[PDB]
Amino acid sequence: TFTNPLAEKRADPHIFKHTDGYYYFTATVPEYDRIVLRRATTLQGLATAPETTIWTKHASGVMGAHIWAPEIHFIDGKWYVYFAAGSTSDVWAIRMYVLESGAANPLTGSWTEKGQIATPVSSFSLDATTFVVNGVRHLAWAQRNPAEDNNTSLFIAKMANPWTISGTPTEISQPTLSWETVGYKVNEGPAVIQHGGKVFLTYSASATDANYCLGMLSASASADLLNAASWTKSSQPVFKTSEATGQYGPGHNSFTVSEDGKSDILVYHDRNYKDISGDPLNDPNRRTRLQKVYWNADGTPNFGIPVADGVTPVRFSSYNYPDRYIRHWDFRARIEANVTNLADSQFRVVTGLAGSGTISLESANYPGYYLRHKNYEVWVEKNDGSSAFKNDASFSRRAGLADSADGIAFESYNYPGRYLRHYENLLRIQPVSTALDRQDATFYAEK
Ligand SMILES: [Cl-]
Ligand code: NA
After folding, report:
1. Phi and psi (nearest 5°) for 105?
2. Could you give the domain comment from the record?
3. Which letter, b or e, does each residue of 295-329 get, where b requires 16 or more Cβ atoms within 10 Å of its Cβ?
């Protein structure tokens, strides 16, 4: 699990996992004047890692204003930082720029400016990211198509080197959909994740207010990624505001990976309030958050909802039906496979309500509702403050009954000897007797 937020007053987060045993984290700071960097051996270490300023805006001319959205990459023996910048003489003439370092440690290393990423059309440009598909390097970025009445569209090009595209850009998405064009017509912040023979390119859309959200384009890893018709745009956001979790305008994301290389991690910013006061560029409250990406059975990513602050939620799968997860539906708890509404199946383990070192399981999509029993049947229901509820929603965490080493089992606090178990797919608390009952009452957290 992670503890959110990772970093206050840090927007447009980018985390790179290097081969040297470190994660590197850069981001947009509210001053918009410089490029910070911090490293840690773990993703959670990043919360306390000290920032170093690797580069500061120029006093005059290009790269002199609006230092926005850096990414750090290690490529062909060297470090590259991609950022966007305006000029002192013109603060909205935002272009894409590249830094290069040959030093082993990018925190202490020395940086050379590779200048502007050239593009045939000279217009508003930012959010350059780079990725390799099938051994071929690409750049994707946000830029104004002057023949469109909007802010930015999405472009992709192959690269000749880390700071230079080859051939011509293809525009692969423009903001047309109702949810893309709130306040401003925007497609920005592209980020690529590849999985199961597919390439997913999430992007940010609408204004950076509560209306900020993620769209997604999908393609085949075998497709020509410069042919616009290779890509399919998702009709609805893949990640948006959750009032229920107090998370507003989630977006400008990137992707990294868990400590074991096994889990994909979504990195992004949001706000914990809806309406900004003052000039939105000047509101510094955007913060950096982490949560695991889960993969759907059809191999698409499932981002769920942006989760409540504090520790991240978990999913529990059945011992005897390892495809099936504890989830709620019409607030009844059950086990089910291939959960489309991902958050119906996330719960965080918290200090038990009833006390004495027990545990409770809070719903991720309905904070302050808990898995609790009533008449021995298990539901998800609002903590009403009563002692009854405290007791129906607390369990003693036991070693799994069919798996003592790695499994987990939930013994009722107010009905000791009754365990959480599935029967006919529905969750109950019932006494456990047969070997099969012991499997019905064993579960795995995060496998
Ligand atoms: Cl579902
Ligand atoms: Na980015």
Report:
1. -110, 110
2. Organized into two domains: an N-terminal catalytic domain and a C-terminal arabinose-binding domain (ABD).
3. eeeeeebbbbbbbbbeebbbbbbbbeeeebbbbbe
The CATH number of 1-310, from 3.30.930.10, 2.115.10.20, 2.40.50.180, 3.40.1190.20, is 2.115.10.20
Pick from 105, 102, 42, 94: which is nearest to 69 by CA? 94
Q: CA–CA separation, 194 vs 201, rounded Å?
A: 9
Please tell me the experimental approach by which this structure was elucidated. Answer: X-ray
Whether the CB-CB separation of 371 and 380 falls below 8 Å is answered with yes
First vs last C-alpha separation in the chain: 13
Resolution (A): 2.2
Q: Which residue has the tokens 């998800």?
A: 380
Q: Show me where the domains of the chain are located.
A: 1-310, 311-447
Choose the catalytic residue: 71, 127, 180, 188: 188
Name the DSSP class of 389: H
- H helices, E strands: number in the chain: 2, 35
Closest CA to 252 of 288, 291, 295, 293: 288
Task: Report how far ligand 1's centroid is from the alpha carbon of 337 (Å).
Answer: 9
| CA proximity to 408, closest of 399, 420, 416, 417 | 399
| Known active-site residue 270 | no
Could you identify the residue written with the tokens 């977006």? 251
Give residue 95's identity as a one-letter amino acid code.
R
Residues 69-82 as b/e (b if ≥16 CB within 10 A, e otherwise) read bbbbbbeeeebbbb
CB 144 within 8 A of CB 123: yes
d(CA 212, CA 12): 12
Q: Which CATH architecture has domain 311-447?
A: Trefoil (2.80)
Bond preceding residue 280 cis, omega within 30 of 0: no
Give the amino acid at 244: A
Residue 323 falls in the annotated catalytic set: no
Least Cα distance to 32 among 221, 255, 256, 280 occurs for: 280
